Design a binder for these strands. Structure first.
Ligand SMILES: Nc1nc2[nH]c(N)nc2c(=O)[nH]1
Ligand SMILES: [Ca+2]
Length: 314
DNA sequence: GGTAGACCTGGACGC
DNA sequence: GCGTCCAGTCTACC
């Protein structure tokens, strides 16, 4: 009862609601789609993970997003804690307005959107976003998710335990920059990205000016931000775009990799024109990104998330 | 200045 | 059962 992960039905008094129609958010299409790798459906329709340094379990009904938090007497989330959730999901951005616009300028989008409503972008923490996507290159979501969990258990602050799961906060720069982190990460299976993690943590702390340097990119322009990030080891144009889009508030950033290339060719009959190559390459990848921005506009990155998410399910 | 490969890891097919 | 695929970044080179 008071033990293990909660369900809306098991502990009614501990949940609080946030008005949110399924049309504005579908947890099942957002949480396991490669935006964040830290949420798990521990119980059917109930997703648990760390949000704003605390463990939460989320679940939804047709018109409500139900939330519960494990912090000391167990109690429902406060209005302020709930705002933390609203902010994580950027609920002030009306998805219905965006879907309308995209669908109006892109007939293909309209068709896909009908069956994949509620795919919005999470507003993630820069550090977590940076290192999680550093682990994402030349990799699959399943493996990435494992890698990220092991990284947090080994170097992140211990939070609370539910059932046999011990939640950890994401590691700090100081921790990832520590001595012998690379070796430990290799034993955890990060492969060659183990060095990228250690090297990038040290680079930010010892060559770029610290956490402030990263957090500052939020106020900088997409072009500036994207350029700064590519300086870090293991961070190319794609990883940088993911970080810009999901943690630095650059809604126009469009991450281009295999999935978007497939979508471009199959659903838009797209082909590079200005680029030299015919297939994927730094020149053609940049061109595709421009194509999507030209098609969808200022929130092209968000539109990308809808089709990308839909392409995973497919 | 724009390519070819090599690359940790492990679930997928293909046979 | 097994060998080749496959889910971006970096770096020798033409
Ligand atoms: N385009 C794109 N690539 C991704 N890779 C990972 N890991 N997540 C994403 C995503 O949301 N979009
Ligand atoms: Ca690939």
């Amino acid at each position: 009862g008071s033990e293990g992960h909660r369900t809306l039905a098991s502990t009614p008094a501990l949940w609080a609601s946030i008005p949110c129609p399924r049309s504005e958010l579908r947890l099942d299409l957002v949480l396991p789609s490669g935006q964040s790798f830290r949420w798990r459906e521990q119980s059917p329709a109930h997703w648990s993970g760390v949000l704003a340094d605390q463990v939460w379990t989320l679940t939804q009904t047709e018109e409500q997003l139900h939330c519960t938090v494990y912090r000391s007497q167990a109690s429902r989330p406060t209005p302020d804690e709930l705002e933390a959730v609203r902010k994580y999901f950027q609920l002030d951005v009306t998805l219905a307005q965006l879907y309308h616009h995209w669908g109006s300028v892109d007939s293909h989008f309209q068709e896909v959107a009908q069956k994949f409503q509620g795919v919005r972008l999470l507003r993630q923490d820069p550090i977590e976003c940076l290192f999680s996507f550093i682990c994402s290159s030349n990799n699959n979501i399943a493996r990435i998710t494992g890698m990220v969990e092991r990284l947090c258990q080994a170097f992140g602050p211990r939070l609370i335990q539910l059932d046999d799961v011990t939640y950890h906060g994401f590691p700090s720069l100081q921790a990832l920059a520590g001595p012998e982190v690379e070796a430990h990460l290799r034993k955890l299976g990060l492969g060659y990205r183990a060095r990228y993690v250690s090297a990038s943590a040290r680079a930010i702390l010892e060559e770029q000016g610290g956490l402030a340097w990263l957090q500052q990119l939020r106020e900088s322009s997409y072009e500036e931000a994207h350029k700064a990030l590519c300086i870090l080891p293991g961070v190319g144009t794609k990883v940088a775009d993911c970080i810009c889009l999901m943690a630095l508030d650059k809604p126009q950033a469009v991450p281009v990799e295999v999935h978007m290339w497939h979508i471009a060719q199959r659903d838009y009959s797209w082909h590079p024109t200005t680029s030299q190559a015919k297939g994927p390459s730094p020149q053609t990848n940049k061109e595709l990104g421009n194509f999507f921005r030209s098609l969808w506009g200022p929130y092209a990155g968000w539109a990308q998330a809808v089709l990308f998410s839909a392409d995973l399910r497919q």
